[PDB]
């Protein structure tokens, strides 16, 4: 009946039914939640993983618009820290999957998420091609 | 204060910003409403408009993840009737723009929405394209 802040991050770059299936798990961990979802910023994102398509402010503009989202970080950080937590208050940390989260899941504040395959925006874009016989 | 309800349909294929945008704009059209959205057949929509990447099932699972959607009536008819407002109890119709609409501006029904340029799924993909120089 309480309460529970739960949080999410990502890059949420071209946002497609797979993130939305992702935050809807989150949201729906339990019963009574806020979903605090943090977006990465352009450059940490560019530099540890890749280029974005869409800067942050149209990444965070495009995930306003989903029911599940009660709350958005823009930017986040790029490593969760302990202290992140008890500043925003945040329960529990829902996320895909030395295991740089083992100290999450020590803590009891790790609750899995799944992914979901085939349904992304360029699987879209994939499907348009497949329109045009090779030959 | 009393509760009014909005229709807007359209085909929903590669949900994007753009129909997010124009989403809001239904729902906010008065302080108190219920927000309808129909979403077009895939046959219908094939015959009438041009292919659609998505299938039904895919476009509606897409909108429901949005805040601004209350109902969703999947498969829509094609064509608005005033026997389908009454069907559904619809006040308003939300849409862009010899006027197939003339009736419903004449009942007092058309609330016009607008269209965002530049942030569409496709326009997305040009971006990317674009990162790589013809020469
Ligand atoms: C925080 C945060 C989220 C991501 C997504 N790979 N990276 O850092
Ligand atoms: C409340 C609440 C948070 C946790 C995990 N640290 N258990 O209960
Ligand atoms: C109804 C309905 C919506 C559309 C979108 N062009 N066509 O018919
Ligand atoms: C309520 C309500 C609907 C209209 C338009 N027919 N005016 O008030």
Request: aromatic content about 10%; hydrophobic content about 35%; glycine content about 4%.
């Amino acid at each position: 009946s309480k309460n529970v802040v739960i949080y999410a991050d990502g890059v949420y770059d071209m946002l497609h039914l797979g993130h939305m299936k992702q935050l809807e798990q989150a949201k729906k961990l339990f019963e009574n939640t806020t979903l605090i979802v943090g977006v990465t910023s352009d450059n940490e994102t560019k530099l540890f993983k890749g280029q974005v398509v869409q800067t942050l402010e149209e990444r965070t503009e495009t995930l306003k618009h989903i029911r599940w989202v009660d709350e958005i970080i823009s930017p986040c950080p790029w490593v969760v820290t302990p202290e992140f937590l008890e500043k925003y208050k945040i329960d529990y940390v829902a996320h895909d999957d030395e295991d740089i989260y083992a100290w999450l899941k020590r803590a009891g504040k790790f609750k899995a998420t799944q992914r979901t395959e085939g349904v992304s925006t360029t699987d879209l874009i994939v499907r348009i091609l497949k329109n045009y016989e090779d030959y």
